[PDB]
Amino acid sequence: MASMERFLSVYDEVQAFLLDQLQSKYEIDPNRARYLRIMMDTTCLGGKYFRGMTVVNVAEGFLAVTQHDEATKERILHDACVGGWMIEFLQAHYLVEDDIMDGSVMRRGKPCWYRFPGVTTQCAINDGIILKSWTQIMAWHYFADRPFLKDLLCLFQKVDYATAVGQMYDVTSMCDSNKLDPEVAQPMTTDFAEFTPAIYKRIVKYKTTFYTYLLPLVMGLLVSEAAASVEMNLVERVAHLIGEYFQVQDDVMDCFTPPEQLGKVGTDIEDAKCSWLAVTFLGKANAAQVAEFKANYGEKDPAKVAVVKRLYSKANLQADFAAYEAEVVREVESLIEQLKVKSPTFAESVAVVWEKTHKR
Amino acid sequence: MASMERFLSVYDEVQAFLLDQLQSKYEIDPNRARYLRIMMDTTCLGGKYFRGMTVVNVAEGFLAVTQHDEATKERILHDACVGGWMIEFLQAHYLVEDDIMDGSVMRRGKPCWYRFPGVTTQCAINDGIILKSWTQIMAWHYFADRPFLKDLLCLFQKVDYATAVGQMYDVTSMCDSNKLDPEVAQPMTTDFAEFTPAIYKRIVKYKTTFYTYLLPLVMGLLVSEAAASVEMNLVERVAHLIGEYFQVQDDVMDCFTPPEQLGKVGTDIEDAKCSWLAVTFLGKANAAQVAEFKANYGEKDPAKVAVVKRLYSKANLQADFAAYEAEVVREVESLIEQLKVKSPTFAESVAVVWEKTHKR
């Protein structure tokens, strides 16, 4: 069976399971079950399923080199799929809540969940809670007797937490740290002293890399009972690097990809985000250019946005991006090499992960 | 050591642990750690700690009848405290998110977290995520080697989920089920056909009773390794009953307790909540009274609110409340009796839980 069709089939299985359990154990009625089915579909489906399919890919790699009964191959693949959906539903929780936080309008060329007419923020915050709660519901159902259950739950737990810490780093990235204070409305930074590569790295590492790259990789290892074919510190380092690169591309697209292609109208500039463009700009601009940036960034006025975009366009950020990209290639290739010492197979799964990121 | 002082001391311990781990493992800076400490204090402290102290109380009951080394008594008490804080932090997660959902203004005579000037909804939704994530962080730290870890996590998991399902039942309780639909903005019910005792019961059971009464009781059992001194179905039934009663009182207070005493301005009538008052009213009103109710309920206009309040005041709902209360006494006393067959001690803990609810 092709991997994607397996993975989509398991979605239907997991859906049915969750909704049947709501009827048998949680006294749900058919209309609320329908609302939840629609919510689940709308918020979990329609992306590329990169994250969830990485779990399946890493497990397939191990199957090709490990002796097992057919029923065991099927069970490992089923578990990789359930695990992959846990990550997809975790992502869905965070997109639902982040869209509400940020006042976002669209996602993937469709309205954000909370904007649907019969949803509203009042419901959608709770729908996002439910999303994450289903990850747990899946795990304990499907993995109840499995030897990797504790390590999977503890891993998932840590990644969830890291992610919520990363959101905190993201939404606060335009304020001066020394002024953070629940009692005082937060001004935007005027110095931009905190728009540094290391601060940017920290945001990205926590907000994106743990759930996008670390968790799918390590979940493939866990459902394959293969965590001893790797040096876990290498897996972390390679996840953090590739995840960085992913986010750099996302930041560039926010500013420069046409909205019809991007699936939304990018607002990083108006939102005063600590983006790769802003940090890279401030790391090379002259005094006059920095002063123009400060007078225009983080403002809704389209004239001011156009000025920041112009400043980026003239600062030859393509050169910095090339150089960055070239360095990420060296470093990711070096980690891949390292990973071969203990597992050629795992090393190749990582190379696929890198190719899919590096080309897209 | 007195139980409450133990429990508060453990809060400081758990706080320090969480914030120290954020600095050593999650690259936090001192200002964001300060924001989080303030958030944790503001959102977890200042209530009566009924829920968390029930875990400690049930464990103390078992200590008085079970032989143990002193170090074991201390360890069980410490675990009961950590468990009690898990429940307090779970509650805090749900109050933070529910206040945002509902557009609530105050809680316990102070502004809702999201209304603090330097918080905002953008941060507070994520702060509430963090709250719940800390429950997990605590459990796996403090309970990593404990024989009750899986049963505690699985229980907690189910209660969290039940709670989020209950919110869904609550926020949708004023719409007609057959019209629920993410594509269509939801009208308020005009028939009130769904304002029945059984539908009300379902809301309350899921929204409140599992986290307020079931979880603290069963968590005391689990940290005491005493789940075999009870018949779990009795524990559930008694939790659901007492929890019902708690909520009935809360609904009555929303309408009739002065706001200075209540800690907030109650808006159940304007919000068109399925409250005990509305269901009890509609179960005894005549045609004219039902028609007046329909023309005035669920509207912000204070004249209309006053009309519904007047309708409640003339419908002699005190008589229904007395009768309800008398029946809850019979039934709770009967469950308590049952619980004595296997554990007098547990039975008494339940009697305390009932007294504290029934008198407050």
Ligand SMILES: NC(=S)Nc1ccc(OC(F)(F)F)cc1
């Ligand atoms: N299936 C879809 S796309 N439903 C939808 C329709 C309308 C809508 O309100 C808007 F966002 F456009 F204001 C949101 C969602």
Ligand SMILES: NC(=S)Nc1ccc(OC(F)(F)F)cc1
């Ligand atoms: N500084 C770093 S790299 N801290 C970190 C590492 C691992 C971790 O657990 C995981 F999320 F990976 F499961 C959490 C935080």
Ligand SMILES: NC(=S)Nc1ccc(OC(F)(F)F)cc1
């Ligand atoms: N000129 C450049 S390329 N400056 C830069 C380097 C690193 C960086 O953080 C990372 F992208 F690596 F996450 C951000 C900006």
Ligand SMILES: NC(=S)Nc1ccc(OC(F)(F)F)cc1
């Ligand atoms: N400690 C407190 S009570 N701080 C606070 C002050 C002001 C405030 O804004 C308001 F809600 F009143 F609009 C909220 C909280």
Ligand SMILES: NC(=S)Nc1ccc(OC(F)(F)F)cc1
């Ligand atoms: N109908 C009922 S009473 N359903 C139910 C019982 C138990 C349960 O697990 C728990 F939350 F208690 F852990 C969840 C739902």
Ligand SMILES: NC(=S)Nc1ccc(OC(F)(F)F)cc1
């Ligand atoms: N007249 C009355 S007392 N009617 C009623 C009974 C039960 C009920 O649900 C519960 F309170 F039990 F949760 C609500 C209303």
Ligand SMILES: [Zn+2]
């Ligand atoms: Zn965001």
Ligand SMILES: [Zn+2]
């Ligand atoms: Zn972006």
Ligand SMILES: [Zn+2]
């Ligand atoms: Zn609410």
Ligand SMILES: [Zn+2]
């Ligand atoms: Zn209430």
